[PDB]
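Retry 2 of 3 after timeout on previous attempt. Resubmitting structure tokens to design endpoint.
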């Protein structure tokens, strides 16, 4: 459960996208587990445009925010699941942190703003879908 509301867009995990998200689809990528749809209202989330590797993420499963050190967006292998077959997910950042399946969508942010959303996790790690390269969300 979680979305980024920037301007006239709504950024969500592709595996949790609703029927309304597909009826107003702007762009989607299975490799990135991202789906951007349109909204009528004007979102106020600031997207970070940077090369940060430290920030704070929100953990629904513990109702706590956590400071984490994270990796550069890369091509990481994600085991098979009930949404996607076993594949390499691109633009993914890993950190040491608690994660549960109901934690997808939780925001990651640095001093500059929103970095990405929780997408993968397991074995003591947590993985984030990066949104800093998507410069069109601001424009
Ligand atoms: C926060 S997700 C999590 C956390 C702890 C343990 N297992 C998970 C589950 C997970 O990693 N998923 C399931 C949903 C689809 C994901 C994907 N991008 O393909 C992979
Ligand atoms: Zn930053």
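Retry 2 succeeded. Sequence:
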């Amino acid at each position: 459960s979680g979305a980024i509301y920037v301007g006239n867009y709504r950024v969500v995990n592709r595996h949790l996208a609703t029927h309304n998200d597909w009826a107003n689809l702007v762009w989607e990528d299975s490799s990135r587990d991202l789906l951007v749809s349109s909204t009528t209202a004007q979102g106020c989330d600031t997207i970070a445009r940077c090369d940060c590797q430290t920030g704070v993420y929100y953990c629904s499963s513990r109702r706590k925010h956590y400071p984490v050190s994270f990796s550069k967006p890369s091509l990481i292998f994600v085991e098979a699941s009930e949404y996607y077959p076993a594949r390499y997910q691109s633009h993914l950042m890993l950190a040491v942190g608690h994660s549960e399946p109901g934690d997808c969508g939780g925001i990651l942010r640095c001093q500059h703003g929103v970095v990405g959303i929780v997408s993968t996790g397991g074995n003591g790690l947590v993985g984030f879908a990066d949104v800093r390269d998507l410069l069109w969300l601001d424009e």
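Attempt log closed. Residues 19-23 form the longest helix (5 residues).
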